[PDB]
From a paper:
Bovine β-lactoglobulin (BlgB) is a small protein (18.3 kDa) belonging to the lipocalin family. Due to BlgB ability to bind different classes of bioactive compounds, its application as a nutrients nanotransporter or drug carrier is currently an object of intensive studies. As other proteins from lipocalin family, BlgB can be re-engineered to gain specificity of binding selected bioactive ligands, and this requires heterologous protein production in the appropriate expression system. Detailed studies, presented below, revealed the presence of uncleaved N-terminal methionine and endogenous fatty acid tightly bound in the binding pocket which significantly influenced properties of the recombinant protein and affected binding of pharmaceutical agents.
Crystals of rBlgB obtained from ammonium sulphate poorly diffract X-rays, and data collection required the use of synchrotron radiation. The unit cell symmetry P6422 was not observed previously for β-lactoglobulin. The asymmetric unit contains one protein chain. With the exception of GH loop which is disordered, the electron density is well defined for entire protein chain and shows that disulphide bridges are correctly formed. The density also allowed to resolve two alternative conformations of N-terminal part of the polypeptide chain located on crystallographic twofold axis. Additional electron density, not observed previously in structures of bovine milk lactoglobulin, was found near N-terminal fragment of protein molecules. Mass spectrometry revealed that molecular weight [M + H]+of rBlgB was higher than the expected value by 128.59 Da indicating the possible presence of uncleaved N-terminal methionine. Fourier maps also showed unexpected elongated density in the hydrophobic pocket of β-barrel. 10–16-carbon long fatty acids were modelled, and the best fit has been observed for 14-carbon myristic acid (MYR). The ITC experiments gave Ka values of SDS binding to rBlgB in agreement with values obtained using milk protein in the same conditions, but the binding stoichiometry in the range 0.17–0.41 was much lower than expected.
Author numbering:
A (entry chain A), B (entry chain A): 0 to 108, 115 to 162
Write the structure that this text describes.
């Protein structure tokens, strides 16, 4: 009834600063990655760590039948690869793996939704392959993979 | 720029008669398996071949913000594992593989959506494994896998 996955030790949050694109997503419940109504079908556009180690997130979200940019803050906690968001719901963010150059893997809160981010709007097989491997104990009932044209669009088409 | 997949030769359509559940789905475009607005996010409930070899399909579909049962007819063609549907759009149906007992794999029409059907609302690893294998040249940007509770519900939750 249990399941485990590698995570980040030695995460220098300051190094994740910049522009990013959500290249893949997966969740354990199909509804979470719902195009209209699911608050985890979000497209990360920029990450902004603060001097003390909080994290400003710029993301897009379908809302009022349109793609919309939210500015969101995520507070640090005692674990540097885990953060928190008290918006409509209470949301924990967990970074699993990153080389800071190419890919960043993270998950969000019994139903998890995970993303593979990249710094350029191209597919990268390494990133995906590490996404697939990092997830493969988690049973993911939905998986989404975007193409390079979608990476540069309003909520990925 | 090209891609190919095994299909059915020797398909006795009469043997696919009965109750079925859509256990998995995949498509090459993410939007096709859209919960609200995508006419391929359909849940097959019963197949009814006619004496001559047409195919009556009972499926569910989200519509007017609610799960709804459609009765749909699919005409045979010169290829017995390929059928046609002229509804709102023009839709070709292609059966890839079936043992008639356990699993039935089919695809529907540059964007394809494919399903793995089963006769009982349980997961079957064989069926999924043959689904995964039958698809794995097709590049599928979305993949959905349902659990046994969803198999017996209104549009799978
Ligand atoms: C390390 C990258 C982390 C990016 C996390 C952003 C995901 C949070 C978006 C959803 C939170 C708000 C949900 C809500 O209150 O409606
Ligand atoms: C062998 C099993 C085949 C089941 C095929 C049923 C899928 C067709 C449903 C979508 C067709 C209607 C689309 C539309 O006109 O809006």
């Amino acid at each position: 009834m249990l399941i485990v996955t590698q995570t980040m030790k030695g995460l220098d949050i300051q190094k994740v600063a910049g522009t990013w694109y959500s290249l893949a997503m997966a969740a354990s419940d199909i509804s979470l990655l719902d195009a209209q109504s699911a608050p985890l079908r979000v497209y990360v556009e920029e990450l902004k760590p603060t001097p003390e180690g909080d994290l400003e997130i710029l993301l897009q979200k379908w809302e009022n039948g349109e793609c919309a940019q939210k500015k969101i803050i995520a507070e640090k906690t005692k674990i540097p690869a885990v953060f928190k968001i008290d918006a409509l719901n209470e949301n924990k963010v967990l970074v699993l793996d990153t080389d800071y150059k190419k890919y960043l893997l993270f998950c969000m809160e019994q139903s998890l939704a995970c993303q593979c981010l990249v710094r350029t709007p191209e597919v990268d097989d390494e990133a995906l392959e590490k996404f697939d491997k990092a997830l493969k104990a988690l049973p993911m009932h939905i998986r989404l993979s975007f193409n390079p044209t979608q990476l540069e669009e309003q909520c990925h088409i």
